Design a protein around this ligand. Structure first.
Ligand SMILES: [Yb+3]
Ligand SMILES: [Yb+3]
Ligand SMILES: [Yb+3]
Ligand SMILES: [Yb+3]
Length: 121
């Protein structure tokens, strides 16, 4: 399996940003949802989510039911536990902190890498 990590930052100052929320979309216009091993919804918090340690499952669902991932105190968020490292996904900023405009969508692959996402004030 594979992971991906993002760091949310202010475009001008490069300071990290807490509280920016994202959904993740695939080519079929479906969005990522985390469940426990019994298929139940799980309450997740800010930051990187260790899917493996917690024995969660990744599923693809409609936008309204998707899991929202949120940058933490150090701007980090993301997860591990992807099956495929060759599929294009897109991080979509659904929850924008006051003071900022949404970042443009970010295409990515689960390639165990980490990249910045920038929000203009
Ligand atoms: Yb907490
Ligand atoms: Yb603006
Ligand atoms: Yb794109
Ligand atoms: Yb950076």
């Amino acid at each position: 399996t594979y992971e991906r990590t993002f760091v949310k930052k202010d475009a001008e100052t490069k300071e990290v940003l807490e509280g920016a929320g994202f959904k993740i979309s695939n080519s079929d216009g479906k969005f990522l949802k985390l469940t426990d091993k019994d298929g139940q919804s799980v309450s997740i918090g800010e930051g990187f989510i260790d899917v493996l340690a917690n024995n969660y499952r990744l599923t693809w669902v409609a936008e309204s039911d998707a899991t929202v991932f949120t940058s933490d105190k150090s701007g980090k968020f993301g997860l591990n536990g992807f099956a495929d490292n060759t599929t294009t996904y897109t991080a979509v900023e659904t929850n924008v902190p006051d003071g900022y405009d949404a970042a443009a969508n970010t295409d990515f692959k689960a390639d165990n890498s980490s990249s910045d996402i920038l929000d203009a004030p």
